[PDB]
UniProtKB/Swiss-Prot annotation, chain B:
Family: Belongs to the peptidase S8 family.
Additional observations: Secretion of subtilisin is associated with onset of sporulation, and many mutations which block sporulation at early stages affect expression levels of subtilisin. However, subtilisin is not necessary for normal sporulation.
Record protein name field: Subtilisin BPN'
Residue ranges of every copy of the Peptidase S8 domain listed in the record: 5-274
Species classification: Bacteria, Bacillati, Bacillota, Bacilli, Bacillales
Biotechnology: Used as a detergent protease. Sold under the name Alcalase by Novozymes.
Subcellular location: Secreted
Catalytic-site annotation from UniProt: D32 (charge relay system), H64 (charge relay system), S221 (charge relay system)
Principal location class: secreted
pH dependence comment: Optimum pH is 9.0.
Residue span relative to the full protein: 108 to 382 of 382
Function as written in the Swiss-Prot or TrEMBL entry: Subtilisin is an extracellular alkaline serine protease, it catalyzes the hydrolysis of proteins and peptide amides. Has a high substrate specificity to fibrin.
Molecular function, one GO term: serine-type endopeptidase activity
Binding site for Ca(2+) 2: G169, Y171, V174
Length: 64, 281
């Protein structure tokens, strides 16, 4: 079971969503700016995507 | 009938309650997504919002801050859950929007508000992978000012021999808290490293949710308020103890678990912390 996507760093947010939804179709995806502070709860159903100001992935996506 | 979530029992908070100490007159800022002040199992004493587009700190559009608040201080009554420090003066310092995220300057503004309003304890169930000089300066100033500052260690799990504790937990002035389950086993997501200080329950933690609901959440976010609530119990029993002393009392009386890289000093034990003489059990 895949829970991290290091190969998506540097890709567009659009390609990242498509790939994550192929691997985990029930994923609850949220897009946030990289370099913010966020809640520290753990949700097995969630994949947060952290993007730079150009909307490319700037941190390894993972479940949580 | 009220229920006592297992984690409140596991850190031995009921021993303090039976001695008569419940966090009365101790001011605790939950620096987070707000707190739903309409919940009948919470009493919110005050607060402020640093989120430019969400100006009401007593409206929690995410749910996270309300859950964290209930672990700190859900009321002692015949409903819902019981908090670690059910008489604490609870302050909603909203620095995260509905989406669970905040700018560094918003978190810093909240820490500054807490200092200016004489908070005794700050809980920050929040984090990010990078620090900043201004963030470190804010937490250091709060600690220099006498505030006990507690944060989630992060949910990054393991990465070989590398530390995965996030900020502000990773700063020396902040107590970084990892998560265990009811068997005292580290949760697989709990961050690791030499900055991990103590552990507290962070798996399947029942607490208050907005709109008069309850539910079980997971995370180092859930572990952190057990320690912030414990700090408030300790201060209610020893109101002249400094933050330095409160911090040492929690660190020095943990139940040691595994290696410190994974478990820090072990599970907090607030009964032992609130005695005069401290040792590990
Ligand atoms: Ca209650
Ligand atoms: Na720290």
């Amino acid at each position: 079971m895949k829970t991290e996507w290091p190969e998506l760093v540097g890709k567009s947010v659009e390609e990242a969503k498509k790939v994550i939804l192929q691997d985990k179709p029930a994923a609850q995806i949220i897009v946030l700016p990289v370099g913010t502070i966020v809640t520290m709860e753990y949700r097995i159903d969630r994949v947060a995507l952290f993007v730079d100001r150009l909307d490319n992935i700037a941190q390894v996506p993972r479940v949580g | 009938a009220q229920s006592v979530p297992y984690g409140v029992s596991q850190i031995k908070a009921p021993a303090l309650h039976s001695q008569g100490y419940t966090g009365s007159n101790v001011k605790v800022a939950v620096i987070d997504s707000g707190i739903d002040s309409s919940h009948p199992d919470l009493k919110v004493a005050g607060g402020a919002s640093m989120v430019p587009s969400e100006t009401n700190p007593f409206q929690d559009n995410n749910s996270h801050g309300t859950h964290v608040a209930g672990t700190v201080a859900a009321l002692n009554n015949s409903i819902g859950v019981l908090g670690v420090a059910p008489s604490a003066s609870l302050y909603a310092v909203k620095v995260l929007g509905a989406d669970g995220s905040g700018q560094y300057s918003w978190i810093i503004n909240g820490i500054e508000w807490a200092i200016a309003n004489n908070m005794d304890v700050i809980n920050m169930s929040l984090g990010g992978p990078s620090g900043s000089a201004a963030l470190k300066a804010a937490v250091d100033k709060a600690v220099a000012s006498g505030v006990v500052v507690v944060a989630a260690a992060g949910n990054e799990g393991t990465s070989g021999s590398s530390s995965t504790v996030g900020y502000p937990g990773k700063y020396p002035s902040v107590i970084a808290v990892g998560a265990v389950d009811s068997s005292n086993q580290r949760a697989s997501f709990s961050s690791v490293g030499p900055e991990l200080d103590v552990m507290a329950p962070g798996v399947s933690i029942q607490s208050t949710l907005p709109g008069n609901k309850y539910g079980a959440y997971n995370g180092t976010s859930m572990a952190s308020p057990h320690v912030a609530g414990a700090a408030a119990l300790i201060l209610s029993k020893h109101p002249n103890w400094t933050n330095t002393q409160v911090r040492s009392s929690l660190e020095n009386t943990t139940t040691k678990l595994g290696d410190s890289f994974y478990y820090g000093k072990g599970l907090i034990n607030v009964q032992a912390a609130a005695q005069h003489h401290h040792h590990h059990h």
